[PDB]
Amino acid sequence: QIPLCANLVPVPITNATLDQITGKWFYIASAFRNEEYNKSVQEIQATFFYFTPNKTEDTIFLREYQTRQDQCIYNTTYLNVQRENGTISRYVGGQEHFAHLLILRDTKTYMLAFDVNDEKNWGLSVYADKPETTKEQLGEFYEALDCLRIPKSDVVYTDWKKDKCEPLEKQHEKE
Numbered sequence: 001q002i003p004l005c006a007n008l009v010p011v012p013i014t015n016a017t018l019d020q021i022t023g024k025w026f027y028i029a030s031a032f033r034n035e036e037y038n039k040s041v042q043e044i045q046a047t048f049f050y051f052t053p054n055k056t057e058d059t060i061f062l063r064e065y066q067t068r069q070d071q072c073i074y075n076t077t078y079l080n081v082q083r084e085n086g087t088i089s090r091y092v093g094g095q096e097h098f099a100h101l102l103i104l105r106d107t108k109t110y111m112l113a114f115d116v117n118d119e120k121n122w123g124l125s126v127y128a129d130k131p132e133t134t135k136e137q138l139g140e141f142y143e144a145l146d147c148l149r150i151p152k153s154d155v156v157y158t159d160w161k162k163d164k165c166e167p168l169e170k171q172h173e174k175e
């Protein structure tokens with residue numbers, strides 16, 4: 001009687017999948033079951049970032065340009081990859097958290113499903129290769145939320161008009 005979620009089926013990460021995610025992405029939206037997670041995420045006004053996989057070490061080097069309180073905060077870190085599980089992981093508050101990487105029909109968008117920990121904390125984020133998207137580009141994201149029974153009204157979106165990091169990224173590139 002519990003309908004299952006075809007867009008959330010894990011898919012093993014290969015060297016080809018690591019090439020597919022190499023490059024620049026924009027953070028578009030998330031929604032979590034935990035309300036404090038939604039409110040925490042609400043302070044992030046925009047974020048774009050670059051991934052550079054290291055296939056030997058099963059890591060990905062992340063350079064992130066986040067706008068928070070109307071300024072740019074730049075940070076680098078390493079994510080771990082669990083190839084056979086289809087997950088990538090990041091240390092959050094000193095604990096490793098895992099997410100399934102789900103590359104969408106259109107390889108221009110992908111989602112991270114945070115469905116590896118306690119069920120009361122599950123959530124979904126979606127990313128694209130441009131800062132703006134259409135409702136249609138987000139079809140798989142909204143279907144998955146419906147299937148996870150997270151209402152659309154809990155989604156937190158970034159607002160690209162608020163970005164402050166394009167000026168920095170531009171200088172990082174001139175150098």
Ligand SMILES: CC(=O)OC[C@H](O)CO
Binds near residue numbers: 062079090112
């Ligand atoms: C795995 C995880 O918690 O996050 C991946 C990263 O935050 C998105 O760029």
Ligand SMILES: [Cl-]
Binds near residue numbers: 147
């Ligand atoms: Cl689904």
